[PDB]
DNA sequence: CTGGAGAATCCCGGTGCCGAGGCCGCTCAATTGGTCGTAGACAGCTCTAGCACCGCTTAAACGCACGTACGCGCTGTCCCCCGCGTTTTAACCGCCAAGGGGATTACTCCCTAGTCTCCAGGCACGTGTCACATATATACATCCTGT
């Protein structure tokens, strides 16, 4: 099937790591689904504009990292950058 | 078993106004300071430095929050200043120093006509068995500036060491230039 | 001069000129000292520092226009630090 | 054989997050590790928010994250309140706080 | 560099307040203004430098400041070229 | 029609109670109705522009979410 | 071939439709731009430019100046009810502000 | 070896000279006049972009451009902009 | 400060409803494998700025001295919102049985748009300068404030 895809399978996979026994209501799961579509578009739009700033025609991981630096308040940005860079580091070795 | 040594210099400079001021009767300007001996950034481990002055001032307890830590002020008499250096880690005991504010020159230095008075002393902050955070902060200290870093007191001796180069080069340059120009114009 | 007569003159005069109100040299060192904590040895285009000043003077003038309305709120003519704080909190800067 | 997402030690979808990138007219070239980075960041924010909301609800004697506690977790965090400053979580109400002036005694 | 927030003098703040309609200023408001201005400046400067470090440049150009102001909801006209 | 009086004084008082207000002036209900009717008309006007453009006759929740994001007021929970 | 006619001219605009559409063609604002988008965008862009240049010049004349300074822009975009709205969150460099002195802070 | 940078100065002086024959414009005021054009261009194009994407469309069009002008410009500002553009599209497709 | 009533909260334990998750079964879409241009990166190299200094000039910041004007505080006065009981309007069913208005979806198809050429005006950057208006000067007009 297809019709309407969403984040629900990843908001519940990531929730089962932080709190193995905690569930999530359909409304709250929908709210998380919506929230991720916010940050995705925000980071990707700032990254597209960043590519446009240094006149690149590609959004690389460097653009995404600089877009993450521009939005997260310090500690949030300092840990999100580490998450992204570790994921990219570990994905290039496989 | 971890011991970290941080070299620092704390002192004061003073400039004589040449006459007693009529507004407040002060005769000297002075700047009291702590700065690092090495070209390193103290702010990586120092939260603030408090300077406690003599009770003649409207507020005796001054504060500074960025290196090179210093306060500029005016006065007419010498007094002891208590400098309390606080570290970023609250678990580390702050350091306490006592500096004798020197504003007047000795007879030998007065006869030499020196334009500034300086009194500064070298010390070493010793952190024995510091916390992990404090150890990381002390080890991760960066360089303060790309330029040179230097010491002043004995001010008369440093000024003489400077002039022993300065006047030599100046006289050489002057005489050589005069000779060149006169020979070239004579031809 | 009756306290408030030479100050109202200045309100009418500084609301009609367009020149910057902060001195340049003192403000440019502040913009370099603030940059200090992000990168050793950063250079600034002259126009970049001018744009920073054009940002900050406008921001402070807007904040002093919103702070005056709060002073007039408590039947005051003096703007008090809690006025800047109320304006800014209602601004969401330090909610 | 192996989802691109799995080859990062993650739970989030590196594969679909690539398609959403290079379909939304952001640029003309999504790199190899642009979606691998964006997916990691998205999963990170989800981890943070989900943990906070989840045991805020479990602080409420609940075993099911409810949007009320989504709002509580977001509004109590100083970093997530800056991020989601202009976002109204529906059916999340507000935060309990009584101005001292109003309060009696 | 050191102690440059003091480069914003009492007259420097009073003139800015006069342009904003303020007639009488208090004693402590000068320090409040310094704090507010310091926070705003630090945020804008940080965001501008984010465009320089990413660009591998050593000089902060005008476009970086313009974009930093735009991200802050402070679109500025006059430095667009 | 004029059914802006459906937002009644008790309702405005409940919205004030939720907002921490613990005492409300008499003329605060005829103010709040003018403040709420301007906010509604703005978000509806934008939701009807997103609905005319899609050549649809019913204002869907997606139109309301898009029009609310246009104002800056961002709401989480209705598919956007 | 035929004498080439531009796109600003056929429509009847001053702002460059070629350059406008051009920023759009390689601007990723979309994926396949049509044949009316740049025309409409340039038309409205330059319409607002004219709308403002009007008020700016009129205020300038009020100041007995023949050259529009940024002041003739702050004063204008704040003097007009809808330009201010459109440019509400926009600071105009070297423009100043309008002399709005609160009534309660006056001589009594 | 030239480094030429584009701007809107040439067409803001055509429009200004035409809508104010006796009035000039300073270089610093033309910088503002340029930034204003680029800003509104960004706004209208971005709103048309979003408009097209909301309807699952890969192309930003002049119909989306008109709806974005309806969303962006306030009431009158809108009306005039929409009318000007609408009439400019029927003067262009009539091969004048 | 204790009393003593009288209302509110506030967890404990109980009892069903129904959403949240459990699984199953195919559809969409992300992976795999491979050829084909090329994004940008990196290695020079031209040449603007940026930076850094130094002098002379003077506006300006600043400290001080002195009243005046404005700011927290008190209290009294009077009304207008709070609390709470009664009258009134809104608003659910049951009773009444389905059309139809309209999103949702495809299959054709013709028109619009990308792609990719080769020209040719027109937009940029010079250069060649002309001149608004900034700075300066003075009387005219308010425009005060102390008598």
UniProtKB/Swiss-Prot annotation, chain A:
The nucleosome is a histone octamer containing two molecules each of H2A, H2B, H3 and H4 assembled in one H3-H4 heterotetramer and two H2A-H2B heterodimers. The octamer wraps approximately 147 bp of DNA. Interacts with VRK1; the interaction is mediated by the nucleosome acidic patch, a cluster of negatively charged residues of H2A and H2B forming a cleft within the nucleosome core. The modification N6-(beta-hydroxybutyryl)lysine is found at residues 4, 55, 86, 90. The modification N6-acetyllysine is found at residue 55. The modification N6-malonyllysine is found at residue 86. The modification N6,N6,N6-trimethyllysine is found at residue 55. Keywords: Acetylation, ADP-ribosylation, Antibiotic, Antimicrobial, Chromosome, DNA-binding, Glycoprotein, Hydroxylation, Isopeptide bond, Methylation, Nucleosome core, Nucleus, Phosphoprotein, Ubl conjugation. The modification N6-methyllysine is found at residues 16, 78. The modification Phosphothreonine is found at residue 85. The modification N6-succinyllysine is found at residues 4, 86, 90. This is Histone H2B type 1-C/E/F/G/I. The gene is H2BC4. It comes from the Eukaryota. Core component of nucleosome. Nucleosomes wrap and compact DNA into chromatin, limiting DNA accessibility to the cellular machineries which require DNA as a template. Histones thereby play a central role in transcription regulation, DNA repair, DNA replication and chromosomal stability. DNA accessibility is regulated via a complex set of post-translational modifications of histones, also called histone code, and nucleosome remodeling. The modification N6,N6-dimethyllysine is found at residue 27. The modification Phosphoserine is found at residue 6.
Curated annotation (Swiss-Prot), chain B:
One of its GO terms (molecular function) is histone H3K27ac reader activity. This is YEATS domain-containing protein 4. It is found in: Nucleus. The chain holds residues 18 to 204 of 227 of the full protein. The keyword Hydrolase does not apply. Residues 1-141 form the YEATS domain. GO terms for biological process: chromatin remodeling; mitotic cell cycle; positive regulation of DNA-templated transcription; positive regulation of double-strand break repair via homologous recombination; regulation of apoptotic process; regulation of cell cycle; regulation of DNA-templated transcription; regulation of double-strand break repair. GO terms for cellular component: NuA4 histone acetyltransferase complex; nuclear matrix; nuclear membrane; nucleoplasm; nucleosome; nucleus. Residues 146-187 are annotated as: Interaction with MLLT10. The record marks 56 as: Interacts with diacetylated histone H3. Its main location: nucleus. There is a cross-link at residue 20 (Glycyl lysine isopeptide (Lys-Gly) (interchain with G-Cter in SUMO2)). The YEATS domain specifically recognizes and binds acylated histones, with a preference for histone H3 diacetylated at 'Lys-14' and 'Lys-27' (H3K14ac and H3K27ac). Chromatin reader component of the NuA4 histone acetyltransferase (HAT) complex, a complex involved in transcriptional activation of select genes principally by acetylation of nucleosomal histones H4 and H2A. Specifically recognizes and binds acylated histone H3, with a preference for histone H3 diacetylated at 'Lys-18' and 'Lys-27' (H3K18ac and H3K27ac) or histone H3 diacetylated at 'Lys-14' and 'Lys-27' (H3K14ac and H3K27ac). Also able to recognize and bind crotonylated histone H3. Residues 151-187 are annotated as: Interaction with TACC1. The gene is YEATS4. It comes from Homo sapiens. The keyword Signal does not apply. Residues 76-80 are annotated as: Diacetylated histone H3 binding.
Curated annotation (Swiss-Prot), chain C:
The modification N6-succinyllysine is found at residues 16, 39, 82. Transmembrane segments: none annotated. The modification N6-lactoyllysine is found at residues 16, 39. The modification Phosphothreonine is found at residues 40, 67. Keywords: Acetylation, ADP-ribosylation, Chromosome, Citrullination, Disease variant, DNA-binding, Hydroxylation, Lipoprotein, Methylation, Nucleosome core, Nucleus, Phosphoprotein, Ubl conjugation. It comes from the Eukaryota. The keyword Ubl conjugation applies. The modification N6-crotonyllysine is found at residue 16. The modification Phosphotyrosine is found at residue 1. The keyword Cell cycle does not apply. The modification N6,N6-dimethyllysine is found at residue 39. It is found in: Nucleus; Chromosome. The modification N6-acetyllysine is found at residues 16, 39, 75, 82. Acetylation is generally linked to gene activation. Acetylation at Lys-82 (H3K122ac) by EP300/p300 plays a central role in chromatin structure: localizes at the surface of the histone octamer and stimulates transcription, possibly by promoting nucleosome instability. The modification N6-glutaryllysine is found at residues 16, 39, 75, 82. The modification N6-(2-hydroxyisobutyryl)lysine is found at residues 16, 24, 39, 82. One of its GO terms (molecular function) is structural constituent of chromatin. Signal peptide: none annotated. Core component of nucleosome. Nucleosomes wrap and compact DNA into chromatin, limiting DNA accessibility to the cellular machineries which require DNA as a template. Histones thereby play a central role in transcription regulation, DNA repair, DNA replication and chromosomal stability. DNA accessibility is regulated via a complex set of post-translational modifications of histones, also called histone code, and nucleosome remodeling. Belongs to the histone H3 family. This is Histone H3.1. The chain holds residues 42 to 136 of 136 of the full protein.
From Swiss-Prot, chain F:
Changing residue 9 to R: Abolished ufmylation. Belongs to the histone H4 family. The modification N6-(beta-hydroxybutyryl)lysine is found at residues 9, 55, 69. GO terms for biological process: chromatin organization; negative regulation of megakaryocyte differentiation; nucleosome assembly; protein localization to CENP-A containing chromatin; telomere organization. There is a cross-link at residue 69 (Glycyl lysine isopeptide (Lys-Gly) (interchain with G-Cter in ubiquitin)). This is Histone H4. Changing residue 69 to R: In TEBIVANED1; results in severe early developmental defects when expressed in zebrafish embryos; results in defective cell cycle progression when expressed in zebrafish embryos. The modification N6-acetyllysine is found at residues 9, 69. It comes from Homo sapiens. Keywords: Acetylation, Chromosomal rearrangement, Chromosome, Citrullination, Disease variant, DNA-binding, Hydroxylation, Intellectual disability, Isopeptide bond, Methylation, Nucleosome core, Nucleus, Phosphoprotein, Ubl conjugation. Changing residue 69 to Q: In TEBIVANED1; results in severe early developmental defects when expressed in zebrafish embryos; results in defective cell cycle progression when expressed in zebrafish embryos.
